Amino acid sequence: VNKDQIAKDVKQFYDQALQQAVVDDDANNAKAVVKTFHETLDCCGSSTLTALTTSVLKNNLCPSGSNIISNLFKEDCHQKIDDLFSGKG
Amino acid sequence: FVNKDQIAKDVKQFYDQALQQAVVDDDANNAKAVVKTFHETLDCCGSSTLTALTTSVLKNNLCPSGSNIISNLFKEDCHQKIDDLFSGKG
């Protein structure tokens, strides 16, 4: 049961929710899901740029307490997903 | 395209594999690392209440920092935490 493939698939699932969530579309619960990921992994986007734009534009999605500049130092959620499945946290 | 159920099952399966390897083989340092990371991240210590208990007993260092053995009987197991993640319940 391959590690890299599942990791890719989680990243994809996240990305899906994120695309649905930034729109305030929630027909598949994407908002709660993105919020759950972001709080669990302490990230706010599929990349630095994305985290930062999501924080600027959809600030309610980011980890509570975190400010916007922090998305330039933190790891993005794809990185954190990789850490989860590779064992670095 | 990714279905929620399937990826959650796949993640659970992956977690189970790592947990088994991590508990019975003390040199599978990659499995241990992963297991430990799942555990700290999701705040749980097994596939189920019982396996969380046996994990806390055989390799307690795999459990979340400052967690206690008896609490594994009252806490959500990692399967339920993984479902919570993909389902949207923090």
Side-chain angles (χ1 to χ4, degrees), chain B residues 4-49:
Chain B
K4 169 212 177 286
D5 294 341
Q6 192 49 54
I7 185 61
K9 277 180 67 149
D10 291 334
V11 164
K12 287 173 190 181
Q13 191 190 8
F14 172 83
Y15 165 76
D16 296 345
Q17 284 185 322
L19 181 64
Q20 185 52 25
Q21 211 175 354
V23 299
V24 301
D25 178 23
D26 206 46
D27 286 335
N29 294 97
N30 184 43
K32 286 157 65 184
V34 168
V35 164
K36 185 61 175 159
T37 292
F38 262 76
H39 285 175
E40 287 301 335
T41 300
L42 302 179
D43 181 21
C44 55
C45 201
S47 54
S48 67
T49 301

Side-chain angles (χ1 to χ4, degrees), chain A residues 21-24 31 44 53-62:
Chain A
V22 304
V23 184
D24 272 330
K31 187 175 169 176
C44 201
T53 66
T54 294
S55 67
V56 169
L57 284 185
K58 261 297 203 161
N59 186 265
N60 47 306
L61 294 186
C62 299

